[PDB]
Amino acid sequence: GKRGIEKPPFELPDFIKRTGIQEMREALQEKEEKIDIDYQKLHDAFFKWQTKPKLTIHGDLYYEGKEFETRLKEKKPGDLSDELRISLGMPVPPPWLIAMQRYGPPPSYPNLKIPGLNSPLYGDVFGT
Amino acid sequence: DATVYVGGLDEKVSEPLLWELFLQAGPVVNTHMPKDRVTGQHQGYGFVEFLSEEDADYAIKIMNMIKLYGKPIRVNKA
Amino acid sequence: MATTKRVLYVGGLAEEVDDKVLHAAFIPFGDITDIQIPLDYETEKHRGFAFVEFELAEDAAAAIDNMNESELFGRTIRVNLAQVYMDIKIGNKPAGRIQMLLPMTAENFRCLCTHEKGFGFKGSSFHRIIPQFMCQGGDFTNHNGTGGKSIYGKKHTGPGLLSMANSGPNTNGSQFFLTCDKTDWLDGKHVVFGEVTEGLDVLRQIEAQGSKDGKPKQKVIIADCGEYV
């Protein structure tokens, strides 16, 4: 099924990218088409600066595509992501919960509480 | 009313900040935010199908309160 | 025979001098009592002269003898004996006042001008402005298009008419538009409910900030609003 889908070659981790071996390998490939940077820094990146990868659950079987369905819980009413805060541009209620004052609590999520109205808020999350 | 048309957006927005964005109001059951293939970029207008109609009429009332990239967002029935 | 020796006439004013500059430092008793000056609806820029009133007559006469041929702003000025509204601000500049004549649709808009139901138009914007068409606002805590709420719940013959924005039949909230031409293609689709009685010039200053796609070139804010009652 993945005939025309063109993906990247390899996504290396931060522990390998912070060692300088990728740039030296790219320079060697450009020269062919050696470095001797360090010997203890690679051991430090392999032992001390080791990053645990994102594993999966025991029932998390591999689907067919498994790349276009990046689903994640259910970010609901009162809880938003950072960047979209940036587009919104409000310094640390999100301002359409000013209009959730006038027009009323949403039919879709009736149980709703959002800060300052019936919900008496810190960081991102302005409603529960 | 179950669906709405949404104009005036910036392509850094995608189907996800619409998902997240309009479910802040009430859950978007079916999302449609075209990806244009030819130049690989978005024109920025949207169609939203909800659970039923009440969700979407409240959505007409409240809904035109989203500002995407400092800029205005059109929401009307459909 | 008259006792109108309170209102003093100031001439040779600068382009920066206004009711404020004259108040804190005018000819006679200007800054005091009341002050009159040539103010526009969109431009809102004084010419060079004006009229200042003094709490008393003696104070006024003394202000003339002095302010007479005085030096203000490096210039020599002369002194001698002489329904709802929205105040609009465009960019950082007051533009002037639009007065409007407005049952259920009129009452909703009236309450949104007074804020007597706990919310309304004050501080909101005209978010969609299209030259030779209309200026749309009432997305108070929205600044989008058809955003807001009515006092009841969630839900065209020429220029200077008030009409309800909507998202189809029976979807009136708080969003409205002021027409900038005959917009008869909207007849039977939007509910017309009032008319501009004063400040059509201020509406033209709002329209001047429009674009074909409706994006305002500068922010247009309802700085204040209320009712004559």
From Swiss-Prot, chain A:
Residues that span the membrane, as ranges: none
Residues in cross-link Glycyl lysine isopeptide (Lys-Gly) (interchain with G-Cter in SUMO2): K31
Phenotype when changing R18K: Does not affect methylation by PRMT9
Residue span relative to the full protein: 513 to 689 of 895
Mutagenesis / variant outcome for changing R3K: Does not affect methylation by PRMT9
Disease: Craniofacial microsomia 1: A form of craniofacial microsomia, a disorder characterized by a spectrum of craniofacial malformations ranging from isolated microtia with or without aural atresia to underdevelopment of the mandible, maxilla, orbit, facial soft tissue, and/or facial nerve. CFM1 is an autosomal dominant form characterized by mandibular hypoplasia, microtia, facial and preauricular skin tags, epibulbar dermoids, and lateral oral clefts. Affected individuals also present skeletal and cardiac abnormalities.
Entry protein name: Splicing factor 3B subunit 2
Organism: Homo sapiens (Human)
Modified residues (Omega-N-methylarginine): R3
Assembly: Component of the 17S U2 SnRNP complex, a ribonucleoprotein complex that contains small nuclear RNA (snRNA) U2 and a number of specific proteins. Part of the SF3B subcomplex of the 17S U2 SnRNP complex. SF3B associates with the splicing subcomplex SF3A and a 12S RNA unit to form the U2 small nuclear ribonucleoproteins complex (U2 snRNP). Within the SF3B complex, interacts directly with SF3B4. Found in a complex with PRMT9, SF3B2 and SF3B4. Interacts (Arg-508-methylated form) with SMN1 (via Tudor domain). Interacts with RBM7. Interacts with ERCC6. Component of the minor spliceosome.
From Swiss-Prot, chain B:
Sequence positions bearing Phosphotyrosine: Y45
Membrane-crossing residue ranges in chain numbering: none
Protein task: Component of the 17S U2 SnRNP complex of the spliceosome, a large ribonucleoprotein complex that removes introns from transcribed pre-mRNAs. The 17S U2 SnRNP complex (1) directly participates in early spliceosome assembly and (2) mediates recognition of the intron branch site during pre-mRNA splicing by promoting the selection of the pre-mRNA branch-site adenosine, the nucleophile for the first step of splicing.
Family recorded in the similarity comment: Belongs to the SF3B4 family.
Disulfide bonds: none
Protein name in the entry: Splicing factor 3B subunit 4
Record domain RRM: where: 2-78
Cellular location(s): Nucleus
Disease as annotated in the protein's UniProt record: Acrofacial dysostosis 1, Nager type: A form of acrofacial dysostosis, a group of disorders which are characterized by malformation of the craniofacial skeleton and the limbs. The major facial features of AFD1 include downslanted palpebral fissures, midface retrusion, and micrognathia, the latter of which often requires the placement of a tracheostomy in early childhood. Limb defects typically involve the anterior (radial) elements of the upper limbs and manifest as small or absent thumbs, triphalangeal thumbs, radial hyoplasia or aplasia, and radioulnar synostosis.
Subunit composition and interactions: Component of the 17S U2 SnRNP complex, a ribonucleoprotein complex that contains small nuclear RNA (snRNA) U2 and a number of specific proteins. Part of the SF3B subcomplex of the 17S U2 SnRNP complex. SF3B associates with the splicing subcomplex SF3A and a 12S RNA unit to form the U2 small nuclear ribonucleoproteins complex (U2 snRNP). SF3B4 has been found in complex spliceosome 'B' and 'C' as well. Component of the minor (U12-type spliceosome) spliceosome. Found in a complex with PRMT9, SF3B2 and SF3B4.
UniProtKB/Swiss-Prot annotation, chain C:
Protein species of origin: Homo sapiens (Human)
Lineage: Eukaryota, Metazoa, Chordata, Craniata, Vertebrata
Result after altering F133A: Expected to disrupt proline isomerase activity. Abolishes inhibition of KMT2A activity
Entry remark concerning the domains of this protein: The RRM domain mediates both interaction with RNA and with KMT2A (via the third PHD-type zinc-finger), but has much higher affinity for the KMT2A PHD-type zinc-finger.
Tissue: Found in all the examined tissues including heart, brain, placenta, lung, liver, skeletal muscle, kidney and pancreas.
Localization (cell): Nucleus
Effect on the protein upon substituting F51A: Impairs protein folding
GO biological process: mRNA splicing, via spliceosome; positive regulation of viral genome replication; protein folding; regulation of DNA-templated transcription
The name this protein goes by in its record: Peptidyl-prolyl cis-trans isomerase E
UniProt entry keywords in alphabetical sequence: Isomerase, mRNA processing, mRNA splicing, Nucleus, Phosphoprotein, RNA-binding, Rotamase, Spliceosome
Record bears the keyword Cytoplasm: no
Name of the coding gene: PPIE
Superkingdom to which the source organism belongs: Eukaryota
